[PDB]
């Protein structure tokens, strides 16, 4: 008699009475004479909160009635879009077949439930699944005159699962109850999305610590490496999630893992300016001289992003201040190219060579004069950079500044005694460079000084 009262409460949406009956000791999987349990009766009447509560009580999601219908079948036939969404989010099989072969997509299509049809198709429902009589959702929608359902079924076709797996959605929302139900149903915590990432990647992206710990306790791979090589530790380091980085390192994340571009987590932390993550990785044994495919070290990444404190921290941990990429670009070269005069000042104060040579003989002063970065030029000239230095083609900083038309840099160089009479390998002077690029003001100022 108590089970009958519980079923009546489930049908009527009286959640308090159903919870009281469950507390008293009524079996959660009890059902009426037709086989409809509390989940079925709640799904028929659109009681979403009752469905969620019963799913939290470890009710069997894939229970079938005497007609072979699951809860998803009943919710699709009854036209309850919210209940269909809730059941799908908790792991309901959208391709389940009843005794006569009906699918939830078929039941939604035959009753002109367009929203349910759209949601099921987006969640991977196969419209090619036919009943025992050979009919399809398209066929029954055509038979019943449901023009919109027919149109949507024809247009969608076989676009496939465009939604994320339910565990990924639970990890994005930090939903521990939904994730627990999903992992109870499907034991595998490393389900893959179309992109190839596990739900642990999603948890590390949003720093959802609760669901991340839940996944790791169920057997998720802390060093799951997709084709691109992006581990959850990489994502946590890039995103700035300090607590997630600590959690992943505690559970056994590998710190020397390289992506397809050979970026270590130290690179990801350094290029985004996360000082605390970089310090944690370095204290756990991160290689500070790791190089990417282009030869960039983490200090190159930190200088590239104008991350001053990250450069300071890396230099404190015995980073090479004159490490060179494949193009022989020092971090000072990168700072001069990007105009980061604060990074350049920090590098120069700790002994970075101001006259370092790249592949084409370019100094940081040459790059500063090329990119109209006056402050970097001033700092370099204060720190002993050669104002008359030449490249492999004989280009002085005045040559580059005059060719690029950067008039203030030309004026500053000429005020400090730079000679406009210098010549290239083509014997061309800065006046030649100014005349070949049509910079009238630069040419006039060059003429007014010594030419």
């Amino acid at each position: 008699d108590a089970a009958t009262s519980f079923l009546r409460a489930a049908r009527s949406g009286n959640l308090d009475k159903a919870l009281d009956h469950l507390r008293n000791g009524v079996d959660i999987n009890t059902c009426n004479q037709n086989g409809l349990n509390g989940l079925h009766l709640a799904s028929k009447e659109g009681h979403v909160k009752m469905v969620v509560e019963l799913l939290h009580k470890e009710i069997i999601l894939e229970t079938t009635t005497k007609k072979g219908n699951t809860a998803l079948h009943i919710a699709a036939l009854a036209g309850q879009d919210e209940v269909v969404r809730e059941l799908v989010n908790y792991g309901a099989n959208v391709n389940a077949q009843s005794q006569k072969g009906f699918t939830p997509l078929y039941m939604a299509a035959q009753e002109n439930h367009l929203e349910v049809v759209k949601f099921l198709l987006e969640n991977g429902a196969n419209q090619n699944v036919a009943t025992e009589d050979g009919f399809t959702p398209l066929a029954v929608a055509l038979q019943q005159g449901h023009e919109n359902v027919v149109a949507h079924l024809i247009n969608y076709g076989t676009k496939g699962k465009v939604r994320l797996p339910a565990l990924h959605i639970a990890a994005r929302n930090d939903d521990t109850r939904t994730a627990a139900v999903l992992l109870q149903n499907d034991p595998n915590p490393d389900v893959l999305s179309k992109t190839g990432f596990t739900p642990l990647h999603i948890a590390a992206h949003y720093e959802n610590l609760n669901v991340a710990q839940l996944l790791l306790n169920r057997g998720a791979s802390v060093n799951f490496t997709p084709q691109n090589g992006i581990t959850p530790l990489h994502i946590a380091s890039r995103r700035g999630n300090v607590i997630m980085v600590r959690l992943l390192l505690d559970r056994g994340a590998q710190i020397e893992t390289k992506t397809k571009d050979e970026l270590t987590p130290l690179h990801c932390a350094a290029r985004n300016g996360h000082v605390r993550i970089s310090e944690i990785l370095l204290d756990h044994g991160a290689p500070i001289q790791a190089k990417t495919k282009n030869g960039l070290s983490p200090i190159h990444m930190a200088a590239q992003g104008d991350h001053l404190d990250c450069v300071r921290l890396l230099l404190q941990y015995d980073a090479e201040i004159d490490d060179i990429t494949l193009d022989h670009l020092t971090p000072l070269h990168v700072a001069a190219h990007c105009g980061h005069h604060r990074v350049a000042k920090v590098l120069l104060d700790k002994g970075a060579k101001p006259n370092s040579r790249a592949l084409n003989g370019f100094t940081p002063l040459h790059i500063a004069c090329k990119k109209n970065h006056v402050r970097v030029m001033e700092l370099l000239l204060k720190t002993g950079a050669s104002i008359d230095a030449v490249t492999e083609s004989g280009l002085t900083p005045l040559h580059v500044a005059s060719f690029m038309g950067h008039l203030p840099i030309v004026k500053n160089l000429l005020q400090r005694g730079a000679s406009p009479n210098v010549s290239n390998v083509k014997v061309e002077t800065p006046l030649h460079m100014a005349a070949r690029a049509g910079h009238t003001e630069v040419a006039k100022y060059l003429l007014q000084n010594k030419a």
Partner: protein, 32 residues
């Protein structure tokens, strides 16, 4: 809406797979 994060394309855009790659080495040769 407020549910685009449940789809593969929006999640892929949010995860920013390009941010984990080395784009290129900026050379910027001055020769014309």
């Amino acid at each position: 809406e407020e549910l685009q994060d449940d789809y593969e394309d929006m999640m892929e855009e949010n995860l920013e797979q390009e941010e984990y790659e080395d784009p290129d080495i900026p050379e910027s040769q001055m020769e014309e």
